[PDB]
């Protein structure tokens, strides 16, 4: 009478119908639900996400050590959303944003809404009023940790002191997430690990996607400062199989290196060969050293585009 596989499908099906698609999924599964996304500005990461970008209408958490590249990703997403004629908001509670760097990543700063809330309640509230207006594509909340409650900001006593920031962060998410769905606005919460920073407790359960951004190498190329190599881990992903990993280089002054990506992604995926030290493509000499090679692809843009193309084919191409 029992047939495991059939029995398992009928179960999973009900799991998803009861809790939403993605509630349960085989890891090796290959998803064919092309959702609307905002390219992360990181091809590898886009593929690692399984849907080629951050899903629209969801809460995304990008936590990690300082300098690890979080903000760069967030901003890159913001640019990608604007390019697609999307409106982006930035709830700043750290006062660290460098608009000049943001322009380099490609963001249209002049059209970017910016707010600097008085208290955490205000911040989330403001961001919430924005979201449910339907005009936004993406909204960014800089520093989960800086969402300090009003009662703490205003001189309040050491009594009645409670994990209010968590509650604040919990209550706030409860109502915004639904609004985000209706509006289809991606919500990135930058969490800078120094509960995952008190309020990160709730976010963990509300986030549809969670990215563990981490600094792993100091791009040297040769013996000198250029940038840093980041490593993101999709620890949570309610819209594709989770736990995938991506890596990319972020050069100083510049954002995520496209060419860097390509050379990387081209290699593992065969198209480009590293005979050992030297890099080559379709028998074309590229250069000794990821950098000489990187440079190559920046100069000879005719290559690189056919490569990005070859890679965009073997992986994520037009669907349905
Ligand atoms: N103002 C800037 N000028 C040049 N390079 C920058 C600047 N800001 C960021 N970068 C580049 C080089 C850094 O190694 C890399 C990481 O910075 P950021 O992208 O700000 O890291 P982060 O997102 O992990 O830290 P955090 O989110 O806690 O502020 O980004």
PDB file of N, CA, C and O and ligand atoms in Angstrom, residues 62-75 94 96 98 100-101 104-105 142 190-193 213-215 226-228 230 250-255, ligand 1:
ATOM      1  N   UNK A  62      21.035  41.110   5.386  1.00  0.00           N
ATOM      2  CA  UNK A  62      22.414  40.995   4.959  1.00  0.00           C
ATOM      3  C   UNK A  62      23.253  41.306   6.168  1.00  0.00           C
ATOM      4  O   UNK A  62      23.569  42.462   6.430  1.00  0.00           O
ATOM      5  N   UNK A  63      23.604  40.274   6.920  1.00  0.00           N
ATOM      6  CA  UNK A  63      24.401  40.470   8.120  1.00  0.00           C
ATOM      7  C   UNK A  63      25.881  40.179   7.880  1.00  0.00           C
ATOM      8  O   UNK A  63      26.258  39.676   6.824  1.00  0.00           O
ATOM      9  N   UNK A  64      26.713  40.523   8.855  1.00  0.00           N
ATOM     10  CA  UNK A  64      28.132  40.262   8.726  1.00  0.00           C
ATOM     11  C   UNK A  64      29.063  41.305   9.325  1.00  0.00           C
ATOM     12  O   UNK A  64      28.640  42.412   9.681  1.00  0.00           O
ATOM     13  N   UNK A  65      30.359  40.972   9.439  1.00  0.00           N
ATOM     14  CA  UNK A  65      31.397  41.849   9.989  1.00  0.00           C
ATOM     15  C   UNK A  65      31.525  43.127   9.166  1.00  0.00           C
ATOM     16  O   UNK A  65      31.209  43.126   7.978  1.00  0.00           O
ATOM     17  N   UNK A  66      31.995  44.208   9.785  1.00  0.00           N
ATOM     18  CA  UNK A  66      32.152  45.484   9.079  1.00  0.00           C
ATOM     19  C   UNK A  66      33.138  45.361   7.925  1.00  0.00           C
ATOM     20  O   UNK A  66      34.131  44.631   8.012  1.00  0.00           O
ATOM     21  N   UNK A  67      32.855  46.069   6.839  1.00  0.00           N
ATOM     22  CA  UNK A  67      33.713  46.045   5.658  1.00  0.00           C
ATOM     23  C   UNK A  67      33.496  44.795   4.794  1.00  0.00           C
ATOM     24  O   UNK A  67      33.927  44.751   3.647  1.00  0.00           O
ATOM     25  N   UNK A  68      32.833  43.783   5.335  1.00  0.00           N
ATOM     26  CA  UNK A  68      32.593  42.575   4.566  1.00  0.00           C
ATOM     27  C   UNK A  68      31.892  42.689   3.203  1.00  0.00           C
ATOM     28  O   UNK A  68      31.767  41.695   2.491  1.00  0.00           O
ATOM     29  N   UNK A  69      31.438  43.887   2.838  1.00  0.00           N
ATOM     30  CA  UNK A  69      30.785  44.062   1.549  1.00  0.00           C
ATOM     31  C   UNK A  69      29.267  44.194   1.536  1.00  0.00           C
ATOM     32  O   UNK A  69      28.683  44.413   0.476  1.00  0.00           O
ATOM     33  N   UNK A  70      28.623  44.064   2.692  1.00  0.00           N
ATOM     34  CA  UNK A  70      27.169  44.183   2.778  1.00  0.00           C
ATOM     35  C   UNK A  70      26.602  45.404   2.073  1.00  0.00           C
ATOM     36  O   UNK A  70      25.796  45.280   1.159  1.00  0.00           O
ATOM     37  N   UNK A  71      27.013  46.587   2.515  1.00  0.00           N
ATOM     38  CA  UNK A  71      26.528  47.837   1.954  1.00  0.00           C
ATOM     39  C   UNK A  71      26.734  47.912   0.443  1.00  0.00           C
ATOM     40  O   UNK A  71      25.887  48.425  -0.286  1.00  0.00           O
ATOM     41  N   UNK A  72      27.855  47.387  -0.033  1.00  0.00           N
ATOM     42  CA  UNK A  72      28.132  47.398  -1.466  1.00  0.00           C
ATOM     43  C   UNK A  72      27.063  46.608  -2.207  1.00  0.00           C
ATOM     44  O   UNK A  72      26.568  47.028  -3.247  1.00  0.00           O
ATOM     45  N   UNK A  73      26.708  45.452  -1.671  1.00  0.00           N
ATOM     46  CA  UNK A  73      25.690  44.645  -2.308  1.00  0.00           C
ATOM     47  C   UNK A  73      24.385  45.427  -2.297  1.00  0.00           C
ATOM     48  O   UNK A  73      23.781  45.659  -3.342  1.00  0.00           O
ATOM     49  N   UNK A  74      23.965  45.855  -1.114  1.00  0.00           N
ATOM     50  CA  UNK A  74      22.723  46.600  -0.979  1.00  0.00           C
ATOM     51  C   UNK A  74      22.625  47.698  -2.032  1.00  0.00           C
ATOM     52  O   UNK A  74      21.643  47.774  -2.756  1.00  0.00           O
ATOM     53  N   UNK A  75      23.655  48.535  -2.114  1.00  0.00           N
ATOM     54  CA  UNK A  75      23.694  49.652  -3.062  1.00  0.00           C
ATOM     55  C   UNK A  75      23.615  49.193  -4.507  1.00  0.00           C
ATOM     56  O   UNK A  75      22.954  49.824  -5.327  1.00  0.00           O
ATOM     57  N   UNK A  94      22.765  55.260  10.620  1.00  0.00           N
ATOM     58  CA  UNK A  94      24.187  55.112  10.908  1.00  0.00           C
ATOM     59  C   UNK A  94      24.939  56.351  10.450  1.00  0.00           C
ATOM     60  O   UNK A  94      25.977  56.696  11.000  1.00  0.00           O
ATOM     61  N   UNK A  96      26.507  56.716   7.593  1.00  0.00           N
ATOM     62  CA  UNK A  96      27.781  56.309   7.029  1.00  0.00           C
ATOM     63  C   UNK A  96      27.792  56.364   5.510  1.00  0.00           C
ATOM     64  O   UNK A  96      28.849  56.524   4.904  1.00  0.00           O
ATOM     65  N   UNK A  98      28.051  56.888   1.723  1.00  0.00           N
ATOM     66  CA  UNK A  98      28.880  57.772   0.901  1.00  0.00           C
ATOM     67  C   UNK A  98      28.220  57.775  -0.464  1.00  0.00           C
ATOM     68  O   UNK A  98      28.474  56.896  -1.284  1.00  0.00           O
ATOM     69  N   UNK A 100      28.787  59.463  -3.013  1.00  0.00           N
ATOM     70  CA  UNK A 100      29.751  59.502  -4.108  1.00  0.00           C
ATOM     71  C   UNK A 100      30.200  58.105  -4.534  1.00  0.00           C
ATOM     72  O   UNK A 100      30.470  57.863  -5.715  1.00  0.00           O
ATOM     73  N   UNK A 101      30.265  57.188  -3.571  1.00  0.00           N
ATOM     74  CA  UNK A 101      30.644  55.797  -3.821  1.00  0.00           C
ATOM     75  C   UNK A 101      29.437  55.115  -4.430  1.00  0.00           C
ATOM     76  O   UNK A 101      29.565  54.236  -5.274  1.00  0.00           O
ATOM     77  N   UNK A 104      29.246  55.502  -8.102  1.00  0.00           N
ATOM     78  CA  UNK A 104      30.189  54.633  -8.788  1.00  0.00           C
ATOM     79  C   UNK A 104      29.557  53.270  -9.045  1.00  0.00           C
ATOM     80  O   UNK A 104      29.697  52.722 -10.138  1.00  0.00           O
ATOM     81  N   UNK A 105      28.850  52.730  -8.049  1.00  0.00           N
ATOM     82  CA  UNK A 105      28.173  51.437  -8.207  1.00  0.00           C
ATOM     83  C   UNK A 105      27.022  51.585  -9.200  1.00  0.00           C
ATOM     84  O   UNK A 105      26.440  50.597  -9.644  1.00  0.00           O
ATOM     85  N   UNK A 142      19.647  50.773   6.976  1.00  0.00           N
ATOM     86  CA  UNK A 142      21.043  50.667   7.367  1.00  0.00           C
ATOM     87  C   UNK A 142      21.041  50.523   8.850  1.00  0.00           C
ATOM     88  O   UNK A 142      20.434  51.335   9.559  1.00  0.00           O
ATOM     89  N   UNK A 190      20.300  45.817   6.603  1.00  0.00           N
ATOM     90  CA  UNK A 190      21.726  45.566   6.800  1.00  0.00           C
ATOM     91  C   UNK A 190      21.952  45.375   8.279  1.00  0.00           C
ATOM     92  O   UNK A 190      21.723  46.284   9.075  1.00  0.00           O
ATOM     93  N   UNK A 191      22.408  44.189   8.645  1.00  0.00           N
ATOM     94  CA  UNK A 191      22.696  43.877  10.034  1.00  0.00           C
ATOM     95  C   UNK A 191      24.209  43.753  10.235  1.00  0.00           C
ATOM     96  O   UNK A 191      24.860  42.842   9.724  1.00  0.00           O
ATOM     97  N   UNK A 192      24.788  44.674  10.987  1.00  0.00           N
ATOM     98  CA  UNK A 192      26.228  44.606  11.178  1.00  0.00           C
ATOM     99  C   UNK A 192      26.594  43.955  12.512  1.00  0.00           C
ATOM    100  O   UNK A 192      26.519  44.572  13.566  1.00  0.00           O
ATOM    101  N   UNK A 193      26.987  42.689  12.435  1.00  0.00           N
ATOM    102  CA  UNK A 193      27.392  41.920  13.597  1.00  0.00           C
ATOM    103  C   UNK A 193      28.694  42.527  14.168  1.00  0.00           C
ATOM    104  O   UNK A 193      29.660  42.763  13.417  1.00  0.00           O
ATOM    105  N   UNK A 213      27.352  37.652   4.739  1.00  0.00           N
ATOM    106  CA  UNK A 213      28.462  38.269   4.016  1.00  0.00           C
ATOM    107  C   UNK A 213      29.687  38.291   4.901  1.00  0.00           C
ATOM    108  O   UNK A 213      29.612  38.689   6.069  1.00  0.00           O
ATOM    109  N   UNK A 214      30.820  37.883   4.331  1.00  0.00           N
ATOM    110  CA  UNK A 214      32.063  37.792   5.085  1.00  0.00           C
ATOM    111  C   UNK A 214      33.301  38.158   4.270  1.00  0.00           C
ATOM    112  O   UNK A 214      33.416  37.786   3.104  1.00  0.00           O
ATOM    113  N   UNK A 215      34.222  38.890   4.889  1.00  0.00           N
ATOM    114  CA  UNK A 215      35.474  39.288   4.237  1.00  0.00           C
ATOM    115  C   UNK A 215      36.381  38.064   4.322  1.00  0.00           C
ATOM    116  O   UNK A 215      36.538  37.502   5.397  1.00  0.00           O
ATOM    117  N   UNK A 226      44.410  46.735  -3.390  1.00  0.00           N
ATOM    118  CA  UNK A 226      43.481  46.998  -4.493  1.00  0.00           C
ATOM    119  C   UNK A 226      42.052  46.965  -3.950  1.00  0.00           C
ATOM    120  O   UNK A 226      41.339  47.969  -3.970  1.00  0.00           O
ATOM    121  N   UNK A 227      41.650  45.786  -3.479  1.00  0.00           N
ATOM    122  CA  UNK A 227      40.319  45.592  -2.929  1.00  0.00           C
ATOM    123  C   UNK A 227      40.266  44.449  -1.927  1.00  0.00           C
ATOM    124  O   UNK A 227      41.203  44.251  -1.156  1.00  0.00           O
ATOM    125  N   UNK A 228      39.162  43.704  -1.928  1.00  0.00           N
ATOM    126  CA  UNK A 228      38.979  42.570  -1.027  1.00  0.00           C
ATOM    127  C   UNK A 228      38.024  41.578  -1.663  1.00  0.00           C
ATOM    128  O   UNK A 228      37.153  41.968  -2.440  1.00  0.00           O
ATOM    129  N   UNK A 230      35.015  38.966  -1.198  1.00  0.00           N
ATOM    130  CA  UNK A 230      33.923  38.687  -0.281  1.00  0.00           C
ATOM    131  C   UNK A 230      33.404  37.287  -0.516  1.00  0.00           C
ATOM    132  O   UNK A 230      33.607  36.712  -1.588  1.00  0.00           O
ATOM    133  N   UNK A 250      35.636  42.959  -4.658  1.00  0.00           N
ATOM    134  CA  UNK A 250      35.136  44.331  -4.614  1.00  0.00           C
ATOM    135  C   UNK A 250      36.392  45.181  -4.560  1.00  0.00           C
ATOM    136  O   UNK A 250      37.097  45.148  -3.563  1.00  0.00           O
ATOM    137  N   UNK A 251      36.693  45.920  -5.621  1.00  0.00           N
ATOM    138  CA  UNK A 251      37.901  46.734  -5.618  1.00  0.00           C
ATOM    139  C   UNK A 251      37.650  48.065  -4.933  1.00  0.00           C
ATOM    140  O   UNK A 251      36.535  48.581  -4.968  1.00  0.00           O
ATOM    141  N   UNK A 252      38.686  48.621  -4.307  1.00  0.00           N
ATOM    142  CA  UNK A 252      38.547  49.900  -3.618  1.00  0.00           C
ATOM    143  C   UNK A 252      38.089  50.951  -4.621  1.00  0.00           C
ATOM    144  O   UNK A 252      38.575  51.005  -5.751  1.00  0.00           O
ATOM    145  N   UNK A 253      37.139  51.774  -4.197  1.00  0.00           N
ATOM    146  CA  UNK A 253      36.617  52.802  -5.068  1.00  0.00           C
ATOM    147  C   UNK A 253      35.571  52.248  -6.015  1.00  0.00           C
ATOM    148  O   UNK A 253      34.604  52.931  -6.347  1.00  0.00           O
ATOM    149  N   UNK A 254      35.752  51.006  -6.454  1.00  0.00           N
ATOM    150  CA  UNK A 254      34.798  50.397  -7.374  1.00  0.00           C
ATOM    151  C   UNK A 254      33.921  49.374  -6.666  1.00  0.00           C
ATOM    152  O   UNK A 254      34.196  48.978  -5.537  1.00  0.00           O
ATOM    153  N   UNK A 255      32.849  48.961  -7.324  1.00  0.00           N
ATOM    154  CA  UNK A 255      31.969  47.987  -6.711  1.00  0.00           C
ATOM    155  C   UNK A 255      32.415  46.582  -7.026  1.00  0.00           C
ATOM    156  O   UNK A 255      33.607  46.321  -7.188  1.00  0.00           O
TER     157      UNK A 255
HETATM  158  N1  LIG B   1      33.843  55.090   0.642  1.00  0.00           N
HETATM  159  C1  LIG B   1      34.457  54.033   0.057  1.00  0.00           C
HETATM  160  N2  LIG B   1      35.524  54.199  -0.755  1.00  0.00           N
HETATM  161  C2  LIG B   1      36.111  53.154  -1.370  1.00  0.00           C
HETATM  162  N3  LIG B   1      35.801  51.891  -1.135  1.00  0.00           N
HETATM  163  C3  LIG B   1      34.720  51.578  -0.410  1.00  0.00           C
HETATM  164  C4  LIG B   1      33.987  52.647   0.283  1.00  0.00           C
HETATM  165  N4  LIG B   1      33.010  52.044   0.982  1.00  0.00           N
HETATM  166  C5  LIG B   1      33.121  50.710   0.760  1.00  0.00           C
HETATM  167  N5  LIG B   1      34.157  50.430  -0.056  1.00  0.00           N
HETATM  168  C6  LIG B   1      34.529  49.071  -0.533  1.00  0.00           C
HETATM  169  C7  LIG B   1      35.908  48.553  -0.099  1.00  0.00           C
HETATM  170  C8  LIG B   1      35.595  47.830   1.208  1.00  0.00           C
HETATM  171  O1  LIG B   1      36.542  46.771   1.385  1.00  0.00           O
HETATM  172  C9  LIG B   1      34.255  47.190   0.833  1.00  0.00           C
HETATM  173  C10 LIG B   1      33.410  46.916   2.078  1.00  0.00           C
HETATM  174  O2  LIG B   1      32.735  48.110   2.479  1.00  0.00           O
HETATM  175  P1  LIG B   1      31.147  48.038   2.711  1.00  0.00           P
HETATM  176  O3  LIG B   1      30.869  47.618   1.184  1.00  0.00           O
HETATM  177  O4  LIG B   1      30.905  49.418   3.189  1.00  0.00           O
HETATM  178  O5  LIG B   1      31.405  46.814   3.733  1.00  0.00           O
HETATM  179  P2  LIG B   1      30.244  46.227   4.674  1.00  0.00           P
HETATM  180  O6  LIG B   1      28.995  46.289   3.879  1.00  0.00           O
HETATM  181  O7  LIG B   1      30.620  44.695   4.976  1.00  0.00           O
HETATM  182  O8  LIG B   1      30.431  47.010   6.064  1.00  0.00           O
HETATM  183  P3  LIG B   1      29.128  47.624   6.790  1.00  0.00           P
HETATM  184  O9  LIG B   1      27.908  47.151   6.097  1.00  0.00           O
HETATM  185  O10 LIG B   1      29.093  47.144   8.326  1.00  0.00           O
HETATM  186  O11 LIG B   1      29.189  49.231   6.732  1.00  0.00           O
HETATM  187  O12 LIG B   1      33.562  48.167   0.041  1.00  0.00           O
END
